Amino acid sequence: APAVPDKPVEVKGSQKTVMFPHAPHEKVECVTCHHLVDGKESYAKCGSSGCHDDLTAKKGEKSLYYVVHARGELKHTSCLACHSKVVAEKPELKKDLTGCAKSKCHP
Numbered sequence: 636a637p638a639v640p641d642k643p644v645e646v647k648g649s650q651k652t653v654m655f656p657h658a659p660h661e662k663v664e665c666v667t668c669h670h671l672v673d674g675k676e677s678y679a680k681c682g683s684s685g686c687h688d689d690l691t692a693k694k695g696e697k698s699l700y701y702v703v704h705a706r707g708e709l710k711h712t713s714c715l716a717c718h719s720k721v722v723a724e725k726p727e728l729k730k731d732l733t734g735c736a737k738s739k740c741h742p
């Protein structure tokens with residue numbers, strides 16, 4: 636796989652800007668985040684050709700909002716998903732990882 640960027644990449648969602656650091660995610664299998672596509676390893680931007688590059692839907696596989704939060708049972712493992720289990724480790728962090736605001740996601 637490509638060389639993991641030691642720098643965080645901005646994820647200009649709908650309006651608010653959120654940057655995700657890889658360092659803090661250098662112990663989590665890529666797949667874990669970079670799910671497979673048609674059983675074909677890929678690493679295209681969250682919003683790559685025929686992917687999640689439409690925040691005008693709000694709900695749908697063509698949305699980068701229902702695959703970012705969705706802390707429910709999804710095909711893969713959403714962010715808020717994992718973070719969910721994490722909170723089960725540092726109950727005193729139920730926000731920094733799962734915070735709508737005043738967090739490391741929504742400052």
Ligand code: HEC
Nearest residue numbers: 646647648649650653699700703732733734735738740741
């Ligand atoms: C990282 C740990 C996040 C936490 C915690 C929360 N959100 Fe978030 N949010 C995140 C990203 C990376 C983005 C960019 C675009 C996307 O949808 O992934 C967002 C964006 C939003 C948006 C804008 C999208 C839209 O539908 O207009 C909203 C409204 C939003 N986030 C709300 C929200 C709430 C209510 C949260 C607490 C449950 C929350 N976010 C947590 C990443 C992260």
Ligand code: HEC
Nearest residue numbers: 636637638639644646655660663664665668678679680681
């Ligand atoms: C979630 C905890 C992740 C893990 C684990 C890894 N990466 Fe990642 N990567 C993540 C996000 C949220 C993004 C961009 C978000 C967006 O909306 O664009 C990325 C982006 C990359 C990129 C750039 C293009 C792309 O594939 O999106 C590369 C080259 C990349 N990531 C590499 C990479 C590798 C090699 C990983 C395993 C060692 C890896 N990432 C894990 C989130 C996450």
Ligand code: HEC
Nearest residue numbers: 672679680681682683685686687696701702709710711713
């Ligand atoms: C195009 C090559 C894609 C890119 C880039 C990413 N994903 Fe994706 N994802 C893609 C498809 C075609 C589908 C449909 C699922 C199916 O049943 O075939 C998905 C699905 C997801 C899901 C599950 C859907 C849900 O219930 O919300 C999640 C959680 C998801 N994708 C996350 C995700 C993230 C975070 C990405 C960037 C880091 C990402 N995908 C890139 C195709 C593509």
Ligand code: HEC
Nearest residue numbers: 654655656659663667668712713714717718721732739740
């Ligand atoms: C488990 C499989 C995870 C998934 C999926 C995602 N993240 Fe995560 N995140 C995880 C851990 C264990 C931690 C703690 C940091 C550590 O030392 O391991 C985090 C932290 C973050 C942070 C804060 C970074 C910090 O300095 O504490 C952010 C902003 C964050 N995570 C964002 C994020 C996004 C946007 C994800 C989906 C694209 C995502 N995480 C997935 C574990 C996991």
